[PDB]
Design a protein around this ligand. Structure first.
Ligand SMILES: Nc1ncnc2c1ncn2[C@@H]1O[C@H](COP(=O)(O)OP(=O)(O)OP(=O)(O)O)[C@@H](O)[C@H]1O
Lengths: 56, 89, 473, 50, 506
């Protein structure tokens, strides 16, 4: 359900067309892009965080 | 086949004093018990890192904080610099 | 005791046919002796014609053989004395020294046609061998237990380069050197021996750090097709017994391919394409795959290449280049600018200049160095045409930085202390990467160009900067 | 797990040089004599069987 | 501990049991061993290409029979086979262990494993010289082999059962394409459906020991060794091993082919197999042909590569797909060997050296690399959004030498030149990062429809990972749509255009 957040962010991108010279607002969206792109590879990267006592 | 039989009996029994009864070894001049189960037993923690990686360091994360509960003397600066951006906008 | 005595039935040039009496025959690649008034004459059995009759290739001159002489057998392959007593002793392919320093009191005698190491023992991550010369360990690093193609004709400091490798492997990794001249010119064989005495890598009284194997040109071709194997076995005993990282120097591998051509054309096998022997890939592999890295130690090989008629689709360089991990070119246009060594930067490329092995920082620094000298070379025409006014600040700084790097590549040698007198600086890798990194950043642009010529590291760069600041005022 | 496989390889190479020791143990015997009887009765078993 | 001695003693019982029935209607003396081949007297009931065993462990294949004597080629160095020894005949045409138990192992040409992981759990033996399947149990290819490279699945697609050639030059990035394809098949080898899994058999011939060691280490870093089969015939070992090893690996492939499953094989590289074959035919006095490969060297690569196609439903819908690798000499496509592999395989991926010299890795020359039955078996989505891309790169290649004049031009050539440079910089790819088709569609889709034209040329390399992470964080449902459907409908296309123009706008 993150697409509503990002859809309203691109809505504010085509509305931040109206204010040229954005200092750090797009950089704040860059920081949420940074850790949101980090968290998905973090959750997909891991194994089930346990020692496999049956086989291993 | 007594060829096979005597071969396998010497095959079983000639290291059986190295495996069954621990009268360590007659032909090998260095001793065998301080090779693998005494020296090389701590081998993998002599081959990997000791007391951080093998003890594995169940470690507490550094609790990173918020903007330290100070709105005023920086929200007014953000507001006036935003006035300056909208001047430049 | 129980000798296997037969008669020589046929002498054809360098081919010798030996008849044996029945139920006695040694297999292929076993050493046979013939006693002469001049010494011993060694044969290696290569083909069995049936009829209890073998056919060998010579290992020394085959004049004067009466057919019917007794043929003594030694069972195994060509034995070589190995170990500590072999150091500083010029051994031919037979196993006898020719420096007239008496017999070599070595402890074992090893075969040379051994097995290459099995696949479970091949080391599964080729690390970087810290050689010691800067431009080697920066741009085209030598693979630890890999293969290195050292190009270029003589007279560009190639012997100086290879003695510098000897001293730096003696210092840093403590490894010994085994030099092997297959097909080596005899005169420059003696000149190499004299120079290796005077540079200190051969001490006739102390502990020398090299074993010489000189298979001369005037031996029959069966000799030169095994001299490299002799040097290889002297490498293997230092590898798998005492556990070191040993440098095997081979000059010159194209003459080894000629030895293969003439041995397998004297045997009457049909010649291949261009005229090299049809056992080309296999009899290059039996020399290459015994130079590798096991879990005990490693032997890294520096072997030259005479490119035939300046052409690289000829199968002898086109077969050597399916094995070489890293090339190193000693060009003309770099020693012509008075640079020691003359490791040309744009040409000497490695298969182990990769960030997954050398690390990210090393690969970044080396990539920026290659692009810097690349842009420098692409600018060197319009530098003469237009001058330094067509350079923008994007460009004139790159010209300055690249002159700084090109002067910075030269290194004071551990062997040019009787040449130039400047004592050699064995530069580590962790100094080298950081030094080139700091010059690529721009933290020493104020330093003049003259203080970068024949400098060890960034610390001696700072010291020479202060000394030339003092001499200018 | 890697070190366990390495220790198994070391056990196997120790028993390989022990096999060399067993070759040295076997080859001094009058099994060199006694074993000709084994071949004799074995050839009796093989060649009669057809 | 003594557990392998237990197993070896059970094998001693087998050897002692075999000694109770050992009567070798065969044995003959070794008359003469020469030229690396043996002549044997006796053996009056041997077969053509029957395996024999000398008295030193070196096996051999009896490849010719004459009235009087039999000529047996060796399978190793001739240092072991001595004159006057004893030649038992095994009884078999040359076979290798096939079956699923080889997955993970590293064998040489005769099924002897050399990894050090015990004996091969062998589900059977199969001949090396199998007749290829005739024209009736064949189906034309209709399933994708998603290699994971961008440019391969963009331009030159590979069908299950389509023999494609990776031709190139020395140290020009030939092996990396096959290695990236094997690592891309991890998408389905972790999965559950058999008919989407794709087993990889990598057959290293003529290469160094340490290269195959590093390649096994690479296929255990990224975990490919639950489905890999390495057949190694390294250049230390002698020539008829290299003549044999790709054929035995093709028998390994046919075992997976007949049993319904799908499997990829990689020959690497057959220009050293023809080296080994010209060695074996120039030591038996057979006279050479053009450039001294012997006159039947077309037939060798024929009878090798023709044991790989797509079986129809009548035999079980299994498959075998081959990627031979040919080392040419300096960008040549017209020596005698690379004009025989081309005249068998269904197309080329000509990895030209000049483009890798400019760092564009992998260096597929687009205007030369073509595939013949690739187009009928691509993923439907890429075929919908790259039907211009081959023609557009042909268009850009037309104006390649026309723009070197430096002359000022019209608007259309500048537009195509900018879009062509963005596409050329776009198809680069780092090592060991294959992109699945679910991510190959949007990147190519951003390339086709002019969205990149505002970006500078250097940002494109990080534009790739940025636009991918933008789609991974937010429009994950579009990636699942491309995964499930494999096809872009109109609504999917419009949503994708919105999701492009969003991230394109910043
Ligand atoms: N995508 C890539 N990323 C990084 N490096 C690459 C890539 N593609 C190729 N290379 C480089 O190409 C070099 C050789 O790769 P590869 O083995 O495929 O070439 P090759 O011609 O097949 O060599 P050989 O024929 O000896 O196997 C490697 O050192 C590798 O670093």
């Amino acid at each position: 359900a993150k697409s509503a957040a990002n859809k309203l962010d691109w809505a504010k991108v085509i509305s931040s067309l109206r204010i040229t010279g954005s200092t750090a607002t797009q950089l704040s969206s860059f920081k949420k892009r940074n850790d949101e792109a980090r968290r998905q590879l973090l959750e997909l990267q891991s194994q089930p965080t346990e020692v496999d006592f049956s086989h291993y | 086949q007594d060829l096979y039989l005597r071969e396998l009996k010497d095959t079983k029994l000639a290291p059986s004093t190295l495996q069954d009864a621990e009268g360590n070894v007659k032909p090998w001049n260095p001793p065998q018990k301080p090779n693998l189960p005494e020296l090389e037993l701590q081998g993998p923690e002599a081959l990997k890192a000791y007391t951080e990686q093998n003890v594995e360091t169940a470690h507490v994360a550094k609790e990173s904080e918020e903007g330290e509960s100070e709105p005023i003397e920086e929200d007014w600066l953000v507001l006036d610099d935003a006035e300056e951006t909208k001047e430049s906008h | 005791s129980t000798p296997i005595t037969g008669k020589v039935t046929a002498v054809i040039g360098a081919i010798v046919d030996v008849h044996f009496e029945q139920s006695e025959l040694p297999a292929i690649l076993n050493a046979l002796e013939i006693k002469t008034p001049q010494g011993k004459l060694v044969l290696e059995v290569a083909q069995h014609l049936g009829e209890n009759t073998v056919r060998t290739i010579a290992m020394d001159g085959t004049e004067g053989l009466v057919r019917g002489e007794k043929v003594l057998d030694t069972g195994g392959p060509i034995s070589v004395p190995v170990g500590r007593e072999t150091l500083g002793r010029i051994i031919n392919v037979i196993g006898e020294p020719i420096d007239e320093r008496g017999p070599i009191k070595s402890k074992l005698r090893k075969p040379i046609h051994a097995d290459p190491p099995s696949f479970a023992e091949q080391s599964t991550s080729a690390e970087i061998l810290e050689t010691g010369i800067k431009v080697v360990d920066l741009l085209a690093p030598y693979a630890r237990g890999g293969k290195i193609g050292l190009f270029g004709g003589a007279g560009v400091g190639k012997t100086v380069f290879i003695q510098e490798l000897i001293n730096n492997i003696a210092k840093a990794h403590g490894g010994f050197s085994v030099f092997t001249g297959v097909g080596e010119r005899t005169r420059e064989g003696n000149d190499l021996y004299r120079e290796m005495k005077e540079t200190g890598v051969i001490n006739l009284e102390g502990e020398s750090k090299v074993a010489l194997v000189f298979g001369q040109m005037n031996e029959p071709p069966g000799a030169r097709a095994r001299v490299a194997l002799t040097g290889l076995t002297i490498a293997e005993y230092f590898r798998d017994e005492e556990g070191q990282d040993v440098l095997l120097f081979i000059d010159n591998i194209f003459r080894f391919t000629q030895a293969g051509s003439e041995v397998s054309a004297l045997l009457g096998r049909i010649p291949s394409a261009v005229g090299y022997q049809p056992t080309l890939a296999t009899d290059m592999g039996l020399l290459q795959e015994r130079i590798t890295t096991t879990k005990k130690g490693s032997v890294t090989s520096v072997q030259a290449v005479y490119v035939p008629a300046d052409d690289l689709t000829d199968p002898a360089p086109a077969t050597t280049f399916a094995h070489l991990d890293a090339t190193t070119v000693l060009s003309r246009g770099i020693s012509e600018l008075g640079i020691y060594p003359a490791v040309d930067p744009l040409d000497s490329k490695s298969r182990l200049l990769d960030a997954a092995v050398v690390g990210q920082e090393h690969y970044d620094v080396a990539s920026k160095v290659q692009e810097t000298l690349q842009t420098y070379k692409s600018l060197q025409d319009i530098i003469a045409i237009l001058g330094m006014d067509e350079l923008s600040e994007q460009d004139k700084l790159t010209v300055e930085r690249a002159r700084k790097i090109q002067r910075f590549l030269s290194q004071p040698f551990a062997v040019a202390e009787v040449f130039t007198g400047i004592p050699g600086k064995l530069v580590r890798l962790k100094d080298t990467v950081a030094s080139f990194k700091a010059v690529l950043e721009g933290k020493y642009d104020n330093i003049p160009e003259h203080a970068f010529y024949m400098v060890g590291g960034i610390e001696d760069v700072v010291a020479k900067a202060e000394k030339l600041a003092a001499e200018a005022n | 797990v890697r070190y366990e496989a390495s220790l198994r390889q070391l056990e196997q190479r120790q028993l390989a040089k022990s096999v060399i020791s067993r070759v040295q143990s076997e080859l001094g015997n009058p099994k060199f004599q006694e074993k000709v009887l084994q071949q004799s009765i074995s050839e009796i078993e093989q060649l009669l069987s057809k | 501990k003594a557990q392998p001695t237990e197993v070896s003693s059970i094998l001693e019982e087998r050897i002692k049991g075999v000694s109770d029935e050992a009567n070798l209607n065969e044995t003959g003396r070794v008359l003469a061993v020469g030229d690396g081949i043996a002549r044997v007297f006796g053996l009056n009931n041997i077969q053509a290409e029957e395996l024999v065993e000398f008295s030193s462990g070196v096996k051999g294949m009896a490849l010719n029979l004459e009235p009087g004597q039999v000529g047996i080629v060796l399978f190793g160095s001739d240092r072991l086979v001595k004159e006057g020894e004893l030649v038992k005949r095994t009884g078999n045409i040359v076979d290798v262990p096939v079956g699923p138990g080889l997955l993970g192992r590293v064998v040489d040409a005769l099924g002897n494993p050399i990894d050090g992981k015990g004996p091969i759990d062998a589900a059977g033996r199969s001949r090396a010289q199998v007749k290829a399947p005739g024209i009736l149990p064949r189906r034309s290819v209709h399933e994708p082999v998603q290699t994971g490279l961008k440019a391969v699945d963009a331009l030159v697609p590979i069908g299950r059962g389509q023999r494609e050639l990776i031709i190139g030059d020395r140290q020009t990035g030939k092996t990396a394409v096959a290695l990236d394809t094997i690592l891309n098949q991890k998408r389905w080898n972790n999965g559950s459906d058999e008919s989407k899994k794709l087993y990889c058999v990598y057959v290293a011939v003529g290469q160094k020991r340490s290269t195959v060691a590093q390649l096994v280490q690479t296929l255990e870093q990224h975990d490919a060794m639950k489905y890999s089969i390495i057949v190694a015939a390294t250049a230390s070992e002698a020539a008829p091993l290299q003549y044999l090893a790709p054929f035995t690996a093709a028998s390994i492939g046919e075992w997976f082919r007949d049993n319904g499953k799908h499997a990829l094989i990689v020959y690497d590289d057959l220009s050293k197999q023809a080296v080994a074959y010209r060695q074996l035919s120039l030591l038996l006095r057979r006279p050479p042909g053009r450039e001294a490969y012997p006159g039947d060297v077309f037939y060798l690569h024929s009878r090798l590569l023709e044991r790989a196609a797509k079986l129809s439903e009548k035999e079980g819908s299994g498959s075998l797909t081959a990627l031979p690798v040919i080392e040419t000499q300096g960008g040549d496509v017209s020596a005698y060997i690379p004009t025989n592999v081309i005249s068998i395989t269904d197309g080329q991926i000509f990895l030209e050296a000049e483009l890798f010299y400019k760092g564009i890795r992998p260096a597929i020359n687009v205007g030369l690399s073509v595939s013949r039955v690739g187009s009928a078996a691509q993923v439907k989505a890429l075929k919908q959004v790259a039907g211009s891309l081959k023609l557009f790169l042909a268009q850009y290649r037309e104006v390649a030498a026309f723009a070197q004049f430096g002359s000022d031009l019209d608007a259309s050539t500048k537009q195509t030149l900018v879009r062509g440079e963005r596409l050329t910089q776009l198809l680069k790819q780092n090592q060991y990062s294959p992109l699945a088709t679910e991510e190959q569609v949007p990147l190519i889709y951003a390339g086709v429809n002019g969205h990149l034209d505002g970006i500078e040329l250097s940002r494109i390399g990080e534009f790739e990972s940025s636009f991918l992470s933008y789609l991974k964080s937010n429009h994950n449902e579009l990636l699942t749509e491309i995964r499930e459907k494999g096809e872009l409908s109109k609504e999917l296309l419009a949503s994708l255009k919105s999701a492009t123009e969003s991230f394109v706008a910043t």
